[PDB]
Amino acid sequence: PVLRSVNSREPSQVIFCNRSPRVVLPVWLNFDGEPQPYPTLPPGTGRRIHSYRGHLWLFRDAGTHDGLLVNQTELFVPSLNVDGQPIFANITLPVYTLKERCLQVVRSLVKPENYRRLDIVRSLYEDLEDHPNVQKDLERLTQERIA
Amino acid sequence: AMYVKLISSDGHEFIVKREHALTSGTIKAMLSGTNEVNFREIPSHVLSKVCMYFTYKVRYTNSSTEIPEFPIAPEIALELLMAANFLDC
Amino acid sequence: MDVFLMIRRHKTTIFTDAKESSTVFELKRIVEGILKRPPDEQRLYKDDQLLDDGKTLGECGFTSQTARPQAPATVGLAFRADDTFEALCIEPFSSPPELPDVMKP
Amino acid sequence: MSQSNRELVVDFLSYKLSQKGYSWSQFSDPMAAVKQALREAGDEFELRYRRAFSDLTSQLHITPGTAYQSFEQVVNELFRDGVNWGRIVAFFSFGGALCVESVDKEMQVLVSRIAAWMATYLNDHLEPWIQENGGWDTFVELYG
Numbered sequence A: 001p002v003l004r005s006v007n008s009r010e011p012s013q014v015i016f017c018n019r020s021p022r023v024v025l026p027v028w029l030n031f032d033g034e035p036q037p038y039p040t041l042p043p044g045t046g047r048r049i050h051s052y053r054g055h056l057w058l059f060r061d062a063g064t065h066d067g068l069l070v071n072q073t074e075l076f077v078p079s080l081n082v083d084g085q086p087i088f089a090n091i092t093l094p095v096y097t098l099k100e101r102c103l104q105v106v107r108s109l110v111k112p113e114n115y116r117r118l119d120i121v122r123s124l125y126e127d128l129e130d131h132p133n134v135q136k137d138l139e140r141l142t143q144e145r146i147a
Numbered sequence B: 001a002m003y004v005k006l007i008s009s010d011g012h013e014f015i016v017k018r019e020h021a022l023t024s025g026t027i028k029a030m031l032s033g034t035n036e037v038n039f040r041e042i043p044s045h046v047l048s049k050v051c052m053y054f055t056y057k058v059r060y061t062n063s064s065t066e067i068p069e070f071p072i073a074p075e076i077a078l079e080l081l082m083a084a085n086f087l088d089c
Numbered sequence C: 001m002d003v004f005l006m007i008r009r010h011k012t013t014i015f016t017d018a019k020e021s022s023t024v025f026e027l028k029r030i031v032e033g034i035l036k037r038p039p040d041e042q043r044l045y046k047d048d049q050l051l052d053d054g055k056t057l058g059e060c061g062f063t064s065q066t067a068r069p070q071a072p073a074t075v076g077l078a079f080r081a082d083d084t085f086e087a088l089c090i091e092p093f094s095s096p097p098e099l100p101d102v103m104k105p
Numbered sequence D: 001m002s003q004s005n006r007e008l009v010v011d012f013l014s015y016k017l018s019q020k021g022y023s024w025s026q027f028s029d030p031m032a033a034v035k036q037a038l039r040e041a042g043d044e045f046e047l048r049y050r051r052a053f054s055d056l057t058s059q060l061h062i063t064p065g066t067a068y069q070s071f072e073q074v075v076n077e078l079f080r081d082g083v084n085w086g087r088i089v090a091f092f093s094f095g096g097a098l099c100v101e102s103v104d105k106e107m108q109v110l111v112s113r114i115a116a117w118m119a120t121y122l123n124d125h126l127e128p129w130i131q132e133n134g135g136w137d138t139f140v141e142l143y144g
Helices: A098-107 A112-117 A122-129 A134-143 B025-031 B044-060 B074-087 C024-035 D004-020 D031-048 D050-057 D067-078 D085-104 D109-125 D127-132 D135-143
Strands: A011-018 A024-029 A035-037 A046-052 A056-061 A087-092 B003-007 B013-017 B036-038 C002-009 C012-019 C042-046 C073-081
Touching (some): A056 A134, B044 B074, B044 C012, C002 C024, C012 C024, C024 C042, D004 D031, D031 D050, D031 D085, D109 D127, D127 D135
Parallel strands (some): C002 C073
Antiparallel strands (some): A024 A035, B003 B013, C042 C073
16 A cells, blocks of 8 residues: 555644635545545635645545646645644646547536447547546556656 | 647638647647648637637646636537547647 | 737637737737738727727726636737728638537436 | 453463464463454454554553553543444454563563453453353354
8 A cells, every 4th residue: 555644643734725616525545545535625615624744635526536636736745734824735627638628528418328429539439438536546646656 | 929820621720829839749740740730620610729728728737826627518529529639639 | 917819800810818908009019910911901809899009908808807718809800901991800610510419418 | 150251361362472472371370162263353353454553553652550551541442332243352452462562572561460451341341242242152153
């Protein structure tokens, strides 16, 4: 288990800030390395939450599981609070590729049973079917530990 | 800066900044192989949306501003998907 | 503050940006550099309203909430022709095909 | 039957001590079916929940003066939401881990004390539930 929260038990006040148009699902990687879902954040809303130093957080579209960014990066690690003011985790849309954005919009209109009834190249069937998930993203982030 | 002319299949001329058009690797290859590119099978209602994506990516990439959604209507999503797959952007 | 535009005449569309405090005349200079015709031979329109060279792009209605990078505002363009002017003519884009059934609710 | 529970405590502690190289004889002093069943269950719990051992090792400043206070806190939070068979073998696995670490940190004086702490808690706060749930024979069937 490479990507997991550190069981520091050191509290850390964090403000989850949803600066995106998506309903954001905060995802916490537990001490065992598994992702756990947390209450969702409507667009524009933000909650002050209790986390711990060294824990790991991902942020996803609560419905389509599209990847979002937190503080311009993919993972969020809370730190100890200076001057009693919380840490801000600003969740925003990444600038998707036009292809991926197109795949998003088509995925939200065609049921997966009907991907093959669309008139496109067969490589676009396999692209429409490779939904974004948390697990595949984790395997990429773990294998990027090399240097 | 410099501009390039992207011509749609129905004859519409789109004049965009060259840096913005170079977002697509295909356009960068068509230009490098003079300042015009003709798209024989990309209609104007799709190529216009592609040009909007160029000005959208250059503005918001590496920018720390709150990024808004790039909108795609359902009537254009299927053709814009095919165009983006060809242009690689 | 920047505004993002589509300067359109006939089958020509120019994708450009400008400051909201930038004037209509200054936008004509941008058109002059690209299409090689001076501002005195240009008429810029917002919809069907003639824009004075002295007004800023914001005072015409092109703000950051209406002239966005992913949804630019459209500015019409007409050139002078002999002793008179040509009329504003923006040829529309193509139409998308009918929405396929698998994409309908 | 009361001190039949004491026999389990001594048996399980001797078992976890001999896995580390220590004998129970150096520190103090069917029924075989429940000992073997509780032996194998403690090892399986130790394999399935290795992080609980690591987390507890790094949190308990273990000291002979404060070892009883640390033992009662751990056991009381272990049975906070009631007792079940799995927690009972975790209770045994905890005392085994407490013993083996006491020998590692050269505090062997606590090996006999721990066995009495476990036997006392087992008779006072666990035997009512065990006999109400069919005795240790129920535990052996559930494990096999």
